Amino acid sequence: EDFYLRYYVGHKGKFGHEFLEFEFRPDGKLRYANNSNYKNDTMIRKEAFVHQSVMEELKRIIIDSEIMQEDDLPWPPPDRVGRQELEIVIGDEHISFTTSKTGSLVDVNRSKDPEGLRCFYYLVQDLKCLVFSLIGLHFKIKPI
Amino acid sequence: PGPQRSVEGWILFVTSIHEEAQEDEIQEKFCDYGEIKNIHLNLDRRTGFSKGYALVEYETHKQALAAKEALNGAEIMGQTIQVDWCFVKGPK
Ligand SMILES: [Sr+2]
């Protein structure tokens, strides 16, 4: 069954740029880049192949979130300050969302689709925890 | 492919973990097979329950394989868990 997942978040903050991006390919390859620490001139860029059980848990988390049924049309668009991109292929279904950096409980609650935006927020946070754990323990580095 | 060791150890990926299980449950089942360097039993970011998976790292390949064969198919809180290598050496 076809599979792909890529998430990117970037922003221009008071202290400068910042971006994080990771991708899981159908062959189990995890690629990760994180340059979120602007107090240093380095970047974190790593890759590794994860076991199929990891890819399966990933699909499980995505299916359970119900994100595959969401649509970003009514979502705030990316702006000159922040941008998030999430692309997923699972079997026949594919989705590609692009939006701004996630705002507050307040902002989301007043948006056109609070339910969909919350679903997006929690899925991204769950994917980040899994990715941070994988990179962090496998390379024995802060994933930051 | 085959198991890929991490920087300072071997990491197993545990799945189908009861949502109410906590680090205790993991420690109790896994310590017998070796010294555990790290356990990440991540919490679901919306609920605060365990999200269903854990990375368990052992100091040696011996320990991790012992645990693997002993714990894949076992149960925690009545729910059958699966235990696999977390990283592999090559594609597909
Ligand atoms: Sr940096």
Side-chain angles (χ1 to χ4, degrees):
Chain A
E1 181 175 58
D2 292 328
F3 181 86
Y4 182 71
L5 163 74
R6 177 183 69 79
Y7 173 74
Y8 169 91
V9 57
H11 105 289
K12 174 158 190 157
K14 180 185 179 178
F15 302 115
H17 283 36
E18 211 171 284
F19 82 83
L20 156 80
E21 184 168 45
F22 53 84
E23 159 192 80
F24 286 85
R25 299 175 162 197
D27 69 349
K29 185 167 184 164
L30 163 57
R31 296 176 61 254
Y32 177 86
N34 191 322
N35 184 6
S36 293
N37 189 337
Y38 52 72
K39 297 189 175 188
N40 73 34
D41 56 319
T42 49
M43 184 191 131
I44 298 162
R45 186 169 186 286
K46 301 284 183 177
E47 68 181 34
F49 282 110
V50 302
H51 189 272
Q52 178 76 35
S53 49
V54 173
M55 301 292 288
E56 286 308 308
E57 178 61 9
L58 203 53
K59 297 165 50 160
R60 188 178 107 313
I61 288 159
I62 290 157
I63 292 311
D64 290 5
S65 69
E66 293 185 32
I67 196 67
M68 296 306 286
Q69 279 68 61
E70 292 301 338
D71 174 18
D72 70 337
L73 200 61
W75 292 0
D79 49 40
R80 289 172 301 187
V81 146
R83 175 194 192 79
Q84 292 185 82
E85 302 172 353
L86 176 67
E87 265 185 285
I88 300 178
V89 180
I90 281 175
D92 31 320
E93 298 163 64
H94 169 286
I95 49 136
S96 185
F97 303 150
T98 298
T99 190
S100 62
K101 282 220 67 170
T102 289
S104 53
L105 163 79
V106 194
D107 297 334
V108 169
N109 266 71
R110 295 173 182 294
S111 72
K112 294 196 168 178
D113 182 11
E115 296 185 339
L117 273 179
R118 292 181 189 121
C119 163
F120 181 73
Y121 176 78
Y122 289 115
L123 170 64
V124 168
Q125 291 298 296
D126 288 331
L127 294 173
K128 280 168 117 185
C129 300
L130 174 57
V131 167
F132 287 168
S133 284
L134 290 163
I135 296 304
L137 298 183
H138 182 68
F139 290 104
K140 295 299 167 192
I141 71 193
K142 197 186 178 59
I144 197 263
Chain B
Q4 170 58 256
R5 163 188 167 81
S6 307
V7 176
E8 314 177 324
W10 293 75
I11 304 185
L12 299 175
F13 193 60
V14 186
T15 53
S16 188
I17 296 166
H18 197 286
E19 72 184 332
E20 287 188 47
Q22 293 177 305
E23 202 167 308
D24 267 348
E25 274 65 46
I26 304 309
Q27 255 306 330
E28 266 78 65
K29 284 295 186 193
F30 286 79
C31 65
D32 291 328
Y33 311 77
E35 192 190 55
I36 306 165
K37 288 188 127 179
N38 282 290
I39 289 171
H40 277 193
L41 170 73
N42 300 341
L43 310 177
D44 173 290
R45 299 292 286 190
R46 187 174 58 74
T47 68
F49 275 166
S50 296
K51 185 69 179 179
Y53 70 77
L55 280 72
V56 176
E57 180 183 21
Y58 287 104
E59 199 166 302
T60 89
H61 174 285
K62 299 187 170 284
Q63 314 177 294
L65 186 37
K68 185 164 194 289
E69 309 197 318
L71 305 180
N72 186 54
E75 347 199 304
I76 295 193
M77 296 176 76
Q79 182 165 339
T80 308
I81 65 175
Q82 302 291 88
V83 189
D84 290 293
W85 287 109
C86 195
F87 296 95
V88 299
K89 286 201 170 168
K92 285 301 171 187

